[PDB]
Amino acid sequence: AAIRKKLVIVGDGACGKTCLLIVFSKDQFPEVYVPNVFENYVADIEVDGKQVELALWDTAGQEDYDRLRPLSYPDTDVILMCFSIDSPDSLENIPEKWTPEVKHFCPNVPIILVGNKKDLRNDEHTRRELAKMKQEPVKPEEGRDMANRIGAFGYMECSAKTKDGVREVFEMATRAALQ
Amino acid sequence: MSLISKEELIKLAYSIRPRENEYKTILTNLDEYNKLTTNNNENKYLQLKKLNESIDVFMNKYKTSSRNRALSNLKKDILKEVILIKNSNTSPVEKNLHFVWIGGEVSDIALEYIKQWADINAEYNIKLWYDSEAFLVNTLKKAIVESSTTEALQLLEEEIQNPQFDNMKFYKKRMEFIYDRQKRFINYYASQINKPTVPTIDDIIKSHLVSEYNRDETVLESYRTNSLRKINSNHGIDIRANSLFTEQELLNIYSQELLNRGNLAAASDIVRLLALKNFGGVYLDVDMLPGIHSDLFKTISRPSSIGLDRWEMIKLEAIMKYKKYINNYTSENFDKLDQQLKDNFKLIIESKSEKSEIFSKLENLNVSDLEIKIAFALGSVINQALISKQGSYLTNLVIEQVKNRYQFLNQHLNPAIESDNNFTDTTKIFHDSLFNSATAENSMFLTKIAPYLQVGFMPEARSTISLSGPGAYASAYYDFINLQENTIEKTLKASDLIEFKFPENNLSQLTEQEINSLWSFDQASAKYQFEKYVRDYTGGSL
Ligand SMILES: O=c1ccn([C@@H]2O[C@H](COP(=O)(O)OP(=O)(O)O[C@H]3O[C@H](CO)[C@@H](O)[C@H](O)[C@H]3O)[C@@H](O)[C@H]2O)c(=O)[nH]1
Ligand SMILES: Nc1nc2c(ncn2[C@@H]2O[C@H](COP(=O)(O)OP(=O)(O)O)[C@@H](O)[C@H]2O)c(=O)[nH]1
Ligand SMILES: [Mg+2]
Ligand SMILES: [Mn+2]
């Protein structure tokens, strides 16, 4: 058979949680638009000789849904805490909003720190429009340091557009859930 | 063929213990199924469901019974038997094409999209469903949103000029006015609807817009009669004259979406189901185009730059640019490619002489009288295209899913609405009700329906999907596969779901009109719209 495991993805709005889930679950990145389809994400994956069915739960990161997010948290096996490489502000919120919330509602549940939109670290337009706000894209050491500070199980970068690192992200989440 | 014989199950489920009454019922149900000679597929399915329910009752009472071994295997058989009935005997759907446009005057864009279908499929009846009493709903919605926009702009006059202003603050503030005005309209409607001279929706809307929004009566009536004339000349058919609404409960759902919320897509969701039930055939959204010939552009290889989705858009753009089958169709993405490919296309397109050589015909769409087919996108279901035989069981299942979700929504929402608080406080009460009713079976559903009041007026408010849209369809699918009812969040595996797919070669979804929803928008569009609002507010108008 297969082992059933629950994954919940959290993080600031616009950092790419939904696209990442779609890329992993359906192996499709929405280049043009996101159709008004039925949202359901379940994926079979084989890790370390086992086969696991991951139920991916999306959340709204905006404060509007601050009070509703906790309905998704029960019985969670693994948490993907996300930030966008092209949003230092997104990374700075990891320990301001997400860490206490995840601790309060999912005690002892392993956290994987995911840095999304890897393909924008070297993007020209990104660097240009980040220089205006006197900022620069997130360095991997910045992310790795934050994983250790928050006590995350692991750190991984990915790009949902290129599918680079997506498999690694979910494989690491699966290993964390099985542990 | 049938299942195992009565005596066969007796044999397979022998115990030392005497036969429990539940077991006798199981054997009777299995026999009645086997002895059944009905050519009606629905009767077969219902007998199977009765059998399955009896098995469940037994296996739940005597959890340690030695019979459970065989009773489990029969269950696995019953599932296999469901498919067996579905796949065995198919006929083509009633040759009806169903479209819906409700709330105002149908545009020429929609008409041209419909024209494509009607040109290619001259044997299919075109049915453009409309509401003869609700031509002014979009006008009222426009009026409410515009009034609310101005109110919110004037409120935050001192702030909107700041380039670091959060646009969400604007949309949140506007929602308060929108809700206030919606309540006012609804209260007026509720007072007017019970007059002896039984007034129509349009009559009440007209009165309300004239009184409260300084609208001209003559202009409104002019528009209304124009809308009626225009739709009646283009395959129009009135929902109010064809008795699509037999259950008051469904009419109530439709009306609450059409009046209280101003969600025309939700109302459309109800109407399409009722139409497919009463008449059968194919339903299509007005942004859907016929399927392109299966290998018309296989000579042209997709460049590494452009993805698949955009590639398909270009295909459509090319067709429209060299055939002009639809006025003012975009060419944005088609213009952004090198003449090598550009010219190449033109040759292939202008080579063909008939429209049928470009688009695919539907001809016979063979289906089972139990099922309903649905369009797929991003490996999930979406009800923008449907195929269903008249009186299909699955369609009734979807209708049941909708009624059930509306029952839960209204039960939790009515107290808050009736409390007559502002938007925030009503939202607070509604959320409290949801929160209190939370289980491990329905939590994801509560999350989805949480911004129900905001649908249409705030970004990322897509509750419609989980009430009248694809969510209900997916639950009804699961309902049918496992002989269940009123499933909330259970879902099927892909292999089991592909069984109900709308044929890919018979649908073109990547149309210019589809990428812009008519009932919801995202945060980026909200940002752009807010900036445009500020520009036009600050610059003035003549
Ligand atoms: O003023 C209006 C606006 C919409 N509609 C109807 O509602 C449709 C919705 O189309 P669309 O604006 O493209 O919605 P989608 O964004 O494509 O949403 C998809 O997912 C939703 C879940 O409910 C559905 O209601 C839609 O039918 C479905 O195609 C149109 O086709 C019409 O039939 C009207 O009748 N009058
Ligand atoms: N360049 C780039 N853009 C992305 C990537 N993932 C998402 N985006 C864009 O960022 C936006 C936000 O994505 P989404 O998944 O909706 O984030 P959410 O708000 O957390 O659900 C989308 O419109 C995407 O086009 C990525 O890997 N690379
Ligand atoms: Mg999202
Ligand atoms: Mn659409």
Numbering used by the authors:
A (entry chain B): 2 to 180
B (entry chain A): 1 to 542
Provide the publication's sentences verbatim.
As key virulence factors of C. difficile, toxin A (TcdA) and toxin B (TcdB) act by glucosylating and inactivating Rho and Ras family small GTPases in host cells, which leads to actin cytoskeleton disruption, cell rounding, and ultimately cell death. TcdA and TcdB have modular architectures consisting of four major domains: an N-terminal glucosyltransferase domain (GTD), a cysteine protease domain (CPD), a delivery and receptor binding domain (DRBD), and a combined repetitive oligopeptides (CROPs) domain. TcdA, TcdB, and other members in the LCGT family glucosylate Rho and/or Ras GTPases at the highly conserved threonine residue (for example T35 in Rac1 and Cdc42, T37 in RhoA) using uridine diphosphate-glucose (UDP-glucose) as the sugar donor. Glucosylation prevents these GTPases from binding to their downstream effector proteins and therefore abolish their functions in many crucial signaling pathways related to morphogenesis, polarity, movement, and cell division.
Here we report the co-crystal structure of GTDTcdA from strain VPI10463 in complex with human RhoA in the presence of UDP-glucose, GDP, Mn2+ and Mg2+. In this study, we used the same strategy to design a tandem RhoA (residues 1–181)–GTDTcdA (residues 1–542, strain VPI10463) fusion protein, where the two proteins are linked via an 18-amino acid peptide linker (GGGGSGGGSGTGSGGGGS). RhoA carries the T37N mutation to prevent glucosylation. We also introduced a K190A mutation on GTDTcdA to minimize non-specific degradation at this site during protein expression and purification. The best crystals of the GTDTcdA–RhoA complex were obtained in the presence of Mn2+ and UDP-glucose that bind to the GTD and Mg2+ and GDP that bind to RhoA, and the structure was determined at 2.60 Å resolution. The co-factors, Mn2+, Mg2+, GDP, and the UDP moiety of UDP-glucose, have well-defined electron densities, but the glucosyl moiety of UDP-glucose has weaker density that is likely due to partial cleavage of UDP-glucose during crystallization. Here we present the co-crystal structure of the glucosyltransferase domain (GTD) of TcdA in complex with its substrate human RhoA at 2.60-angstrom resolution. This structure reveals that TcdA GTD grips RhoA mainly through its switch I and switch II regions, which is complemented by interactions involving RhoA’s pre-switch I region. In the GTDTcdA–RhoA complex, the RhoA switch I is stabilized by extensive hydrophobic packing involving residues V33, Y34, V35, P36, V38 and F39 of RhoA and residues M313, A377, L378, V381, I382, I465, P470, A474, L510 and I515 of GTDTcdA, suggesting that this new conformation of the switch I is induced by the GTD. Triggered by the GTD, such a movement of the switch I positions N37 of RhoA, corresponding to the glucosylation target T37 in the wild type RhoA, into the UDP-glucose binding pocket of the GTD, where N37 interacts with residues R462, S517 and S520 of GTDTcdA and UDP-glucose via hydrogen bonds.
